[PDB]
Ligand SMILES: CCCCCCCC(=O)O
């Protein structure tokens with residue numbers, strides 16, 4: 001009451017409050033030293049403590065955003081570090097906070113993290129334990145500005161547990177790396193997923209996220225009722241709206257209340273929440289988010305009875321045009337848990353479009369009667385793409401699959417920057433190994449729900465510097481139809497070739513000197529540059545010359561002595577390739 005900061009301090013705590021203010025400061029001022037953030041966080045914590053001590057103290061009844069802005073832009077006084085943000089500290093709410101959000105750079109130019117030796121790491125661990133963790137939050141926060149803040153509190157706890165367990169024992173080295181590598185890969189997949197849920201709210205509206213929540217939650221919690229699912233959807237969309245416009249303190253407090261509410265009414269929602277509701281406070285929210293699908297209730301009546309075979313559908317749509325679509329998306333999703341939540345959204349849009357021209361054109365019950373018959377092509381389009389691409393996967397392997405995708409997507413949009421083309425085709429090829437092990441029933445909810453994440457990275461790294469017109473149209477036209485837009489483009493007849501640059505195909509030394517995971521990029525980028533050299537005369541057997549590149553390495557990889565072999569076979573290879581016209 002009368003003080004939001006005091007209420008947040010009382011609710012969250014003292015250790016969860018200082019952590020959430022370090023994340024908020026680091027996600028806004030990405031290029032700032034650690035000590036500055038520590039000082040600001042300490043000052044904010046002291047101010048909050050004083051406001052808790054006396055509610056009618058010096059001014060602290062102001063909204064959290066106002067205090068954030070006052071400590072952020074009126075105190076930092078660094079304009080050469082962040083250009084044009086000096087003019088940002090000139091407006092009022094809600095203009096200043098909106099201004100701050102466009103400057104969160106998704107791909108900052110910061111040095112890549114290098115992991116020190118285990119001995120030094122655990123030596124520094126048992127000296128300033130309270131600071132060693134605070135450095136972990138700072139780096140992950142600044143490199144991933146849209147990371148899910150209450151989730152990042154969980155990763156810090158797992159990091160601390162991992163350090164406490166292993167190197168306070170024998171075999172310090174080969175205990176930590178197998179565990180820390182699990183968090184690094186799990187931390188780069190929960191940041192791309194949250195970016196998608198957060199770019200669907202500030203670009204496509206709250207009506208787009210609410211439908212996604214209704215479709216997703218109804219799959220995972222059947223045998224519930226629309227009254228319960230609507231409440232859960234409203235609470236969830238309130239939670240996820242606050243983690244996007246920087247209200248981390250209010251986002252972490254609302255998530256805990258939602259988890260508590262779900263655990264209280266466990267029986268009315270799902271029968272698989274017994275285990276997740278007996279965990280600590282930070283682990284309940286993670287367990288509930290990844291709970292498995294509940295068993296479908298038996299004896300569900302066919303959906304055609306009261307959606308196409310009832311003489312009130314037009315009246316029901318006229319009465320309210322979003323609660324009827326909510327019911328259709330809820331009923332068609334609880335009984336189809338083998339569909340991706342983006343395919344279900346597409347069918348709901350098709351039903352709405354059919355009803356729009358049928359509830360206001362002559363006889364209603366003559367044109368929407370066969371609406372369910374036109375759902376078949378939409379259903380069969382992605383399952384014929386998963387069955388084919390995943391068949392291509394288990395005859396080439398991961399590395400050779402990423403190359404096939406790389407050539408396919410370079411000819412579709414031969415104007416995106418090479419680092420983006422390489423980095424998005426490497427992520428696309430990892431869906432072929434992530435869930436091709438699943439049976440056919442579980443393939444679609446995993447593949448198409450992962451591709452939608454990856455393609456999002458192609459759009460948020462392209463909004464900053466729009467170069468290709470096709471990518472702009474596919475990204476900014478519809479959220480659900482973003483994947484069918486991409487997998488429908490033929491080879492671009494425009495984009496006259498890039499001409500010949502000799503220095504690109506001039507591999508000099510190295511290569512067989514560093515890790516396999518990183519030396520692969522230095523060859524995939526060469527392949528990308530090769531494709532953009534001849535977009536049109538690029539028939540499949542021509543890229544067998546790609547194998548020759550490997551050969552050009554192989555010999556010199558074992559003949560590293562007389563390193564001039566790199567140049568010799570390089571000029572030989574480029575002469576032979578140019579003589580081959582492809
Ligand atoms: C407290 C965690 C909230 C879980 C409800 C649904 C989560 C999701 O589907 O993302």
Ligand SMILES: CCCCCCCC(=O)O
Pocket residue numbers: 207208210211214322323325326327329345348349
């Ligand atoms: C692309 C959105 C399709 C579903 C519209 C209704 C959403 C809701 O239930 O609020």
Ligand SMILES: CCCCCCCC(=O)O
Pocket residue numbers: 385386389390428431432436447451486487
């Ligand atoms: C099993 C993975 C299937 C999809 C791979 C990527 C298809 C595409 O977007 O062209």
